[PDB]
Structure formats: C-alpha cells, structure tokens
C-alpha cells in the first residue's frame, strides 16, 4: 500500500512537509509500475532509496563587517553514490532547512540519473542569508564552510555546485579554499569560471537543453519547433537562451517577461533584439517594458504570456507561473506543446488538463536538465585535462538530451503520445534500482 | 533576555522538544553569572555553544534472521571538541532522534568539563531496537553501522562508549569492526572487555563516585555518612557498588530495590549480604525478592525505598522514580542529604522540595560522574600501554570527584549550603568557555 | 644455463608446481631472443621479473545460512606494476592457492603488456566454493572478504575483475564494498553492470577482436576476409562473435560446432541464421544439431570442423581442440590462416606444422585479447566520466586489435610471413622489461 | 577430533612443516582445557585463531658491494590484532620462509598475550644473509625492505623488533627509513638504542623477569631466593643478570657456564667478580682458582633452586634425577625450552615448582612493552623506574599463570601458562565479534 508506506517513512520526519511531499510525488507515480515490475520491490528498495546515505550538518562561525561574530547552520546531503559521486548544488538563504535540501537532493538523485552521465545525488546549503552582504562578508562565510566541508568533497566522492544564493561568485570563493585546504586541483566544484577549469556552454545549457529535449518530442509526434509560435515566459539564463536556440530551429518566439510583464512581439525575436533584450536585463536597472518601449512592441504590464495564441508554451520564469486557468487559454487558443524550462512552473491540475487534452508536456525533470547534464560535461572536460570547443559540448549536450528523451519514451506508455511525467519519473528510478541492487546490501 | 535567546535559538529546530528542554535548563540557571561576567558572554560565545560542530546522520542497512533487509537511521553528534576529542555514548533505542542526541550530546559536553579530564562532548545511536533481536542480528547490525562510522572516529578525534541498549558486547562488537577496517588499534571506545584494553573499577565507578562526592559533600556541611541510615534504590552496578562504598564509610545502609519490589533491612547490608546480591542480580531472573528470602529480610512488593525513614537517599536505579510524594515524605521523615546516582531520578518538582527545604541535592550531572571520568582513565591507561591496578583507578577516580565537588561548591552560592545544580552548570560551563575563547573563530 | 635459472628460482618456492611450469614455459619461450639480446638480461632483470612486488594473503571470516561460521582464505598478487596498476582477475574456487595465483598472474603480467594498454599484472581469489552457495552466503563472502582487500587496491593502483567463481554478480558486491568503505565511486573494478560504469561491446569483445587481428594479419600478407570460406569451432560466447564480425567484413562463415558435433553451410552464416544459433545456444538443452535440423544443413555427429577445406580457421572452443592430425587435413585443404579463439586450442606440435608449412598463425595471447582491451576501455570511459556508444567502443577496441597486431610484426623477424608466436611473445615481455629497467632499483 | 582438527588446518598448507608441528603442539597443550570448556570452541574460535589475520610477501631489490643487483623475499606475518597491534620481531636468514614465520608468529601471539601487557603478535623477515655483508650492504637491503614494509607498519598498527640476524644496527636502519618516510617519530620498533628512544634495563630484562618471576612463585609456596643455593647454566646474557639479581635477593649462586663446561664456586657469586664474568668461563675460573669441570653440566652440584639459562633441552631426565636427589626445590627456565618434557613431569610429580621459559622468560617481551611505553609517555624512566616496572609486570605473568594453574598441593605453572595466554587470546576474539 502507498499509504502505508509514505506513512512509515514519515514516522522518522514527522515535521518535514517538503521532503514528505517530494517522497509522495515520485511514489504515487512509481507505484503502478512496481506492481507489475516485482524485481523492484526486494532488498527493501524503496526503505533504501529515501533514507540519505549521510547527511553533515554543521556550524559556521564567521565574521561580519561590524565585527560582530556570527552563527549560522549548513549542511551537505549526500543522498546517493550508486550511479557515481554524489552531485547537487549548494544553495544560501535563510529559509533553508534539512526538509528542503532532502527533497531537493532526493530530486537531484533521479535528476542526474536520467543524464545517463555517472552522477550520484546530493544536495547542500545554509541559512546563511547573502542578501545585503558584502563581497567580504560572502568570501568569509564561503571560506568559514569550506574549512569544515572541504574533508567530506572530492573528485570521486562529492562535487558541488551553485544554486539561489551561490553564483558564479561563490562557487570561485569556495573551489579556491578546497584547493588551499586539500593541497587538490581536481575537479570538486562544477559551475567554475573559465580561467580555473570552467566549460563553455554552462550559461547556454538549460535554455538549450530545454529546446533540444522539446524538438525530440515534437519530431516524434510529427512536429517541429519550424515555423511554430512560441511563448517563453521569465527573461533570465533560461528564457534567453531557450530563446536563442528556438530562433535557430526557424520558430518565431513572440514573447519574453519579467515579474510584472510581458512583451509581445508577434514578428518574433532575432538575434539583435535578443542581444538588446539580455543586455538591458543583465544590469538589474532594465526592465522588460523599456525593451518594448525600445522596440514599439506591445507590452501587458502585470500579465503573462498564456492569454496569447501559440503553437509552444515555454515556461521559464518560476514555479506555479502556469495554472489550469491559463492551461484553458492555451488549449483554447490551439496549444500543441508545452515543456518546463523553469522548476515546477505547471501546476498538477494544469499539467492534468494539459495532459488530458493532448497537448505534449515535457516535464522539467527532464526537460530542464541541461544545466545539470553541462554539469557533468565540464566534471568530463576537467578529468580529460583537455578544454572543450563549444561546438563540441554543445553537441554532447544535445546527444545527451535525445537520450533523456529516449529513456522517456521507452517507460512512457503505449498511447498515441508518450507520457513524460510517468516516463521521466520511471527511466531515473531504474537506473537508480538497478545500481543499488547491483551493489549489494551497504 | 533570556527568552529572547531561547526563542531564537529554537528558530532553527522548531520541533527539537528535548534539546530546547535542556539548553532551557542550562541557561536559566546560567543567566545570573553572565550578568555579573559579561566576558563569558563575549564573542558571541553562547550561540557558538548551542550549535553542534557536527552531526552525521546516516543510513544502516542490515538483514535480519528472517534474511529480511532492514533500513535504520543512525547518528554521530559531534558537539563540542573545545577541551578534547568528541566523547559520549551510544543509544540503540526506537525513540532516538535527533533532538534527544543534541540534548544528550549537550550534557555530555558539560559532564565530561567537570571531570578535569580532556575530553569533549558527544553523542549518537540509532533508532535499531535491540529488543527480541538474535545476538547474531546485534552483531551484524553494529557491524552495518561502522562500515560508516569507523571513518568519522579516532583516538584523538571522538571516542564513543556504551549508553541504555547498548552494553559491553556492542561497544566489543564496534570496537571489532572499528580495528578490522582502520587497521589501527588505538582507543576509540570506553566500556571495552579486560580482555581487549578495558579498565579495572569500571563497574564500581558510579556508584564508588557518588559515595565520594556524597562524602565530601556532606563533610563540607558538617556530616558524614558514619553512622548514617542510607536508602539505596536500584540493584544494578550503580546502586551494588555505592552500597559497598557507603559501607566502608561507616554507613548503615538499609534499602535496595528492582523494578518489582524493594528490600528493607534495618540492621543494615554487610559484605557478605552484598556479595550475594550481586551474585543474583548477575543472573538472568535474580529478583531481589530472592535475595529477600534467602535472608528472611523484609520485602515489599510494588514498593520504592522512598517511605522509609533515613538521613541519606540515594536514587540509583532510573529515571524520575523520585517523585513528589516521594520528597515529602522522605523529607517529613528528616532526610539530610539525596544524590543521584541513576540519570536524573529526581523530577524537578521534587528536586525544587528538596533545596527548599535545606535539603543537600547533589545532580547526577556531577555526582554520577564517577563513570565518565573513569572512561577518561580507561583512555589514559590505553594510551600509557600499561594498565593500572583497581587501588590505582579507584584513587584517581576519589582525587578527581574531589575536584568536581570542590568545584560545584566554588561556584555554588554562600548560602547555608551550597546550591551543587548551581555549582555544577557554571562549573561545566566555565571550563568549557575558556577553552572555546582562547581557540578563536572556528 | 635455462635449467640453472629455473633450479635457483624454484628454490624459493619448491612446491608451487603451476608456477614453476609457468615461469618455464615463459622463460623457454624467451631465451633464443634474451641471448641474441643481453640488455635484456642486465640488471638482474628475469631475477626481479619473477619475484611478485607484493603478496597478501589474508583470512576471511563469514556465517552461512545454517549460522555457522566459515573461515576462508583469500590473495591478492601484485606481480608487476612496471607499465600500470596491478590488472587481474579474481578467482573463487576450492582448488585456488598461492602457486596458481602467482602463475595466472605472472602469465597476466606480459598479456595485459601485450594488448599495449597501460595495465600492471596481477590476480587473486579465495578458496571459497560458490557452488551451492546461496545469493546472501556469497553476498556476505563479498564483503567480508573487501572488509580488508579494499585498503590495497584503487583506481591508480590495483582494479581487480571476474574470473571462475566471480561474474557480474559478484564483481557488483565487491564493487559496491569497496565505494561503500571507500567513500570513493572511482573505477576499482571492471566487468561491472552498466547500471554503475560497465562498459558496452563486452559481450562481443573477444570475438570481434579475434576477427580484427586477423584482418590485420592477412592484409599485412597480401590477403583479407572478403570472399573467404572460414570455419569456426565452438558456439559460445567467442565464436557467435567472431562468426558476427566475420561476416561484415564478407567473408563466407561454413561451420559451427559444440561438444557433440559441427554444422556446415556451404552458402556460409547469415545474420538470420546467426541470430538464430544464438537463441538455440542460449538454453541448456539446445544444440548445433537443432540448428542444423532447423535450417536444413549438414550436420556431422562427434565430429570437428577441421576436415572441410577453408581459407582460414578459427578454432573458438577449447584448449588442444586443434592437433596434428587435424592440421594436415586443413593443410593439404589449403588453408591460408589459423587465428585462436580459445584459450590455446592449438597443440604445440600442430602450431608447429601450421608454421612450417607457410600457414599465417595468430596465437591466443594476441589474437583473444580483445577482452582484456574492452577492460582497458571500460577503465578509460570511468576515467573520462563518460559512457560511449557501442559503435564507439567497438571502433576503440578496433584501434587496439591493430595496435597488437603492431607489436607483434615488431617483434615477429623478417622472414616471408611474420612470426607471430614469436612476436607476441617478445613483445609483452619487451614492454615489462623496458619499464622496469627505466624506473630503476625498486 | 584433535587429530581431525589438525588434519584439516593442514589441508590449506601441506607443506608447512614447522607451521603444522607449532599448531600441534599449542592444541595438544590446550585440548584436555578444551574438551572442559566448550565455550572456546565455539564461533569456529579454533579456525580463526590459526589462520592469520594478514601476511605480506614482497620483493626486496638491493645493490651488493660489487655493484650486482640483488633479489630477496621479505615478509610480515600479521598474525593477531585481538589484543592489540602486531608485536614480534625481524629475522634475517637464508633458511627463513613463510612456514618458519607462521610457526614463530603464532607461537608469539600467545607469549606476548601471557606478559599480560597489550600486544598482538606478528613476525617478519627476509631470506636476506646478513653474514659477510658490509655495513654499507646491510643498511641498503634495510632500507629497501622499508621502502616497502614502512606502508604496513605502525604504533598502534604493528611495531616489529630484532631477532635473528636484526640486531640493534639493523633495527635503528629501519626505524630510521620508517622515520623517514612516514614523516612521524613515533614508536614504531622496538630495541632501539638509547640515543632515540631506546629503554634501559633492556640487557638485564630476560634474567632479571626470571628471578622476578621464581620469587612470587617461591613466595607463594612459602620460600624465596634468601639465603637459599641456586645454580645457573650459561653465562650469556640471560645467565649474567640472572646471577646480578638473585644475589640481590639474598641467594648463593655458585655456578655459571658455558660450552667448554662449568666452573663452580661454594662461596658464591659476589658483585665484583660476576662484572669480570661479563668482560671475559675457564679463564675467569683460572683467574680465581674457583672448581672447574670440563664438557659437563652444573646439574650434578646439590641446590636448592636450578635457572638452566643456556640452551634447548639442557635438563635431561638423569639430571633431574640428580637435581631431584640433591633435594632441589624449584627450576625455573631462562632459556628458551631447556627442560626436556620427561624432567618436567617427573619435577612435578617429585614436588618440585617448576616454572616454564614462555613465562619466566618473559623479562625481554615485558620490556619491550616497557619501551613502547616510554615512548608512548614521551619520557625516558631511569633504570629503577624500569626495573620496578618489569618487576610489577612479572608478577602480573605469575599472577595469569595461578589463576589456570589449578588447584593442586602447587599450581601447575605449564599448564597455568598454556591457558593464560590462550584465554586471553580467545576471549578477546570473542567479545571483538566475526572479523
């Protein structure tokens, strides 16, 4: 029974909601499929799968800019080694809990596991808040964790990366004191510039990724993104280069947004108006409405995309930017597919809706994991000891994507259009049984 | 002020009922120091004691007589390193968590201070019942546990010991598999055999402790326990070997009891009537109702020692058995002095009683402390590669509950007599503090 | 002069026979080139070829189902890590010692020299008998066994892998033991499951090497597959891939065989008609005959294959399948080439005549390494973080074959054919000695 | 069962002689103890404690005087890590193989487990031979080994020592390529010189343990050495200090010896003459007109209490016959086995202590743990704070002896001993789990 035995797992967290929120998920979807699997059921599988084969927590002591001596808690979950080393970002911000670092390594576990690359899960952070810190203040904490993390990482054990909270800036600042500290320069951060180890492709990946998984799963019902209207929503890493890459397969992308508007652009982008657009984004002062006021293009200010008729819907802006009420839009304004770039943006009744009216959904669990799966490129490149072209990576990348799309395919269902979500959900699991069941009792 | 702390402190572990319980008791009764030494409260240094320098939560996978695979979580609290290596027990109990380790891995941070020795605080276990479980299935479960915990102890890192289920043959079982895998054979448990670098007057050594702390605790105040009608309650190691030092003390003691009934024998235990007490407590079923009979002594069944009338109580058996009712009747009947030598038997609506009405109160956090500090010689002794003889422990281990009285009673008030719960939190605090300051930020 | 050698070397270990034979039978092999060339003898190098770098033997102890508890003992050889990492196999079965373990890998040392990768020599095994051994006894002998073996080998030092008594299965257990106690997910195994590393082509490796070395062979003498009538022995693993490769570079595939007789096609194999061999083959009970039967071929009861005439001959059944009497028959049928599948199915006597008479000949040592390489190639794929594609893999192994083939024609003097014999046996003895007389006195 | 227990650890090495004779004479000891208490043989104790825990062999490639490379094979028999880490010493000689090592190794992890000091057993060596090779050879072949055996070793890990062919030059080449290489000054051998770590009472350990251990077993039976008459046989190192230390309890040792005979003195040894003993037997005898006898042994003079300290089976059946007559009262044994097993039985049935070499010998293994201790404490004991260590020590030994000694007229100290050291062994197995 799924009931009893989310309710037993729940019995050693009774308190944490995200984690047993994020066990449910994947145990309702998987549930169907163990019935008629039995292979997956033995060893105590499932009882193996959520308790995390270590978590660290630990203290931070720092000092900030009033020299006043702070306190502040972090933790590294190592959920899982079966597939490789343990693989997740870190993330900073005072609403970090050990409940939401499980749920999200547990989510990186199947996540990575799908990239077909050998990358375990994990996932880490603190309630350190970087908001309104100074450069100082960040080095100092980021080096004040590394002096307890650095003994519990490597390059065949753990590999770390950014996440809200740690950039491109905090990745430098922490990789730099485990190399100090370990006396080490393998590869033990990923998210790395590209004057210490760093790939090409990283900022390009998601977007990308996004678009590639997407065009497998039209090509395969009959389509293409070639001449289709497409609405990306969010005008961040994401949106923009999932922009770029859909301009290139000959689709007119008509909008973009920010978190209080929208433009529309019924032409559709180019590469100049692009360049315009991620230029006024990129300072924090531009916004979306003077990009359209720049190029007398119609603007809603305080609405999304979804009221408009499009072929694509790309969400790539947030969490629950796209409910059943928009869901009605799109399917009645002749929707065809709609693919996650962002983390969660459909909400389940949408994604229902969407499901049950034909329309395609690539799911962000897969459809998103390109950053993750650059990730392991760049982990690649670094043991190679040899940097990579970016035609090159953008290549493996794209041969990476139509192999999560396969996978997907493969557990998908026997319907006249593949489920993703089942699919998804099914292909990172088995890759992650199998290698537990392979390795023995540990 | 203090409220204001412990509300903050809580923020972080919302639901940590029994570790907010004890930093509650800690700082209460720390609180008026720290107003007339403000450096104690320099640095930041409250909120850097409350977090643990690490804990290790993992996963133990092991299979049962059934050939059933089981799933347990386990913990390594590693509190405080300020003085020495991380050092404290380990619990196999269905009730551990997090938040009872944290709170026992506190204590055991203050205890171990007391002693004088160098030694940190720790704490761990996991939620494995050992209940019902084949000496087989024990085995492999200790065994499951170190294949991850060996990496994170050592001589001079953190050295555990045993705790409620987990007796000599599991520390002997951990210890095992600890010397397999590091290949190393220094001391990284306490509570080992003879047979494999154990100490001489490890079981006397709680008991024989509250006997000396007792002593000198009543000599401060003008007494003795020459002469003395003591009530012992309990017949396990603590409560057999307190009788046996109380004895040689010149003490008339006429109590012992199990959890079915308690022996009563005014003419007082000799050492012959000890001997064969021990003797029967020492099989599987011996009842003290048999050790009753085989004297013709008076035995009540269902009964605690409390109602008889005596100068001297001494709690040795479990956990709050003195009560209210208890108090005032033994305090009706004029009882001088109580110490604990089980873990806090006294509830603290009874311990309230009993300072209020100039009753002398010695806390097991001090007077039980006999058995931590003995642990600490076991180390010295392994670590010297010659054992000492039992004449030579049991002075040491007099000399060192001497210092831990002697410091209760320096920071234990100038009233009629010393408040040792008082004495005892500052004395624990303070030592553990200086270390903390003069070791910078880390 | 050889016998002195090899009477002072016995002496240290006079009774291990399997060893003594193998140093012979190298040393004899070796002795014409080492006279003709002393450098090769300078430097007291046979005297240090023959004595292992290091041994350990070591205890294991494990319960079996009936909870008694067994005592085994296990090995580990580093015979030579001149060129690499100590490479070998590990062996379980009642009859493994010392002797046959120094002599499997001191034979292992100059075969992984041969295939031209950077691979040490070694091998190991325990007298455990796996036979009639449950899933739990061997999963408990695994990791009781890897409870010490773990801390002598690694990625960069020894990468142990399957061999009698130890397949997938058991290579998974000890894998996993040894990234559990490890705490590092590094490639310390090959032949591990592709759910955790495995590599593809394995299956196929030593028959498509086969088919590659002898390509290189023919074509170096005038002469290629295409067109070819080739009769192969044995319907195992090595022949069902060597049929498979051998018919895409065209040749005509006439025989097939088990231990009960050969089938013959004049009109040569398909892949119709492979595919179909293969799933006879794959049950306990289906035979060659049934194959025959099923497609209407000729089908010669307790016979070999070696009577029809054939260009070439590719004996992939078993050691001494292939005598004298059965090279005049293909001899005085014409044949242009033998290649070996098994392990030494070639008499020496009949080697001899196939030599003599202008017959190519490719020995095993060369020309069945395509296994040992596809080790190599898993090794690297960890190495890079990356899994290939089969194609990928398959062309890899391809490049080696030729590599091999390359060494040898080194090797393999200047007459009108090359030697190969002689050159596969110069050339991996050539390569261990070149290193050990570079890297000095150790 | 004792012949089919046998029968079946020999299986696995057919063709360890010395190894096979070691497990056979340890098991027929202990058998009769065995068949009475069940509990040490259950867990398949018996079949552990013979296999070892781990054996290294490996190569030592070393550079003669003549410039010719050399090939030799070195091993470290880690036999017994129950107690605590490997304990046991080197041996370099031609004739050493892994039969000879197993057999010495094994019967060490029951010796250093009688000191009752925390000590595993292990030993180790190389076919290497010492003899005719420089100083300059002999350091290169240490250093070769170590630049292997340092990654094995270690304090709490395995501290070897000399023995055969290792003497006190050859364990400071390898303590130092340890030191070396590890980067890390503690002890990892013991017999060390006293310039680096070295302890003192080292030469004086094995006789002085022997007198130590003779007086509590006296005492216990109401005598001691005061006043009594003792003969001692050698006059090498265990025979000098045996002599130094039983004068200093008050007895009259009137005999020494060596190869050529024995010479005998009535007035007994005084402290002046025993040093001049030391320098130089019958040239000491010319040079006190003291009675000599030629190619015989000191067993015919009437005594009270007989130290054979010179070699295997020296105590004869006749000679205890003579001993016996003379009215003896205890032997005790310096050497290592001096006292054929015929004399044993008939001294302990004729009433007669008698104390067994593994356990009055005993001086030289507690001294080493002396040693390990020092370091450990990082302080040097002057030589009585060492003395009456080894002191408290031997009586520590007597005292594991008596409590499996039985309870007879007179314990039985070879019995006493046997099981001691086994017990101590099998109960830490025991509680340390399946390993």
Chains 1, 2, 3 share one sequence.
Not at 4 to 20: C, G, I, M, Y
Not at 248 to 260: H, K, L, P, Q, Y
Request: aromatic content about 8%; charged content about 20%.
């Amino acid at each position: 029974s799924l009931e009893s035995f989310l309710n037993h797992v729940q019995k050693r967290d009774p308190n944490q909601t995200e984690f047993a929120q994020a066990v449910r998920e994947v145990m309702t979807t998987l549930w169907p499929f163990l019935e008629q699997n039995p292979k997956y059921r033995q060893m105590s599988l499932l009882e193996r799968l959520v308790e995390p084969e270590r978590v660290i927590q630990f203290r931070v002591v720092w000092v900030d800019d009033r020299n006043q001596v702070q306190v502040n808690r972090a933790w590294r979950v190592q959920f899982s080694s079966a597939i490789g080393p343990y693989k997740g970002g870190m993330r900073f911000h005072p609403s970090v809990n050990l409940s939401i670092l499980k749920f999200l390594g547990f989510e990186q576990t199947f996540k990575n596991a799908l990239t077909t690359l050998p990358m375990g899960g994990g996932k880490g952070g603190s309630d350190f808040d970087p908001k309104g810190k100074s450069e100082g203040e960040v080095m100092r904490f980021c080096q004040a964790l590394m002096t307890e993390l650095y003994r519990h990482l490597g390059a065949d054990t753990d590999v770390p990366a950014g996440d809200i909270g740690v950039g491109g800036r905090e990745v430098g600042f922490m990789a730099g004191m485990m190399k100090k500290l370990s006396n080490n320069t393998a590869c033990v951060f990923t998210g790395k510039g590209l004057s210490f180890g760093g790939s090409l492709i990283r900022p390009e990946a998601t977007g990308y990724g996004l678009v590639y998984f997407t065009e497998a799963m039209l090509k395969r019902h009959g389509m293409g993104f070639e001449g289709m209207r497409v609405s990306v929503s969010g005008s961040g890493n994401v949106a923009q280069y999932a922009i770029e890459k859909a301009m290139e397969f000959g689709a007119r992308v008509i909008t973009a947004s920010d978190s209080s508007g929208t433009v529309v652009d019924e032409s559709g982008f180019t590469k100049e108006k692009l360049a315009r657009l991620i230029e006024i984004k990129s300072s924090r002062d531009g916004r979306v409405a003077d990009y359209a006021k720049e190029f007398g293009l119609v603007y809603l200010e305080g609405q999304q995309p979804w009221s408009v008729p499009v072929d694509i819907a790309l969400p790539c802006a947030t969490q629950n930017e796209l409910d059943v009420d928009a869901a009605h839009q799109l399917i009645a304004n002749g929707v065809k597919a709609v693919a996650e770039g962002a983390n969660m943006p459909t909400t389940i009744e949408a994604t229902e809706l969407f499901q049950q009216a034909g329309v395609l959904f690539a799911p962000g669990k897969a459809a998103n994991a390109g950053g993750v799966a650059t990730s392991g490129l760049e982990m690649a490149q670094n043991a190679a000891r040899l940097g990579w072209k970016a035609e090159k990576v953008d290549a493996r990348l794209h041969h990476i994507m139509l192999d999560i799309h396969h996978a997907c395919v493969e557990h998908g269902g026997e319907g006249e259009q593949t489920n993703y979500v089942q699919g998804a959900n099914i292909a990172g699991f088995v890759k992650v049984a199998d290698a537990m069941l392979a390795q023995g009792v540990i």
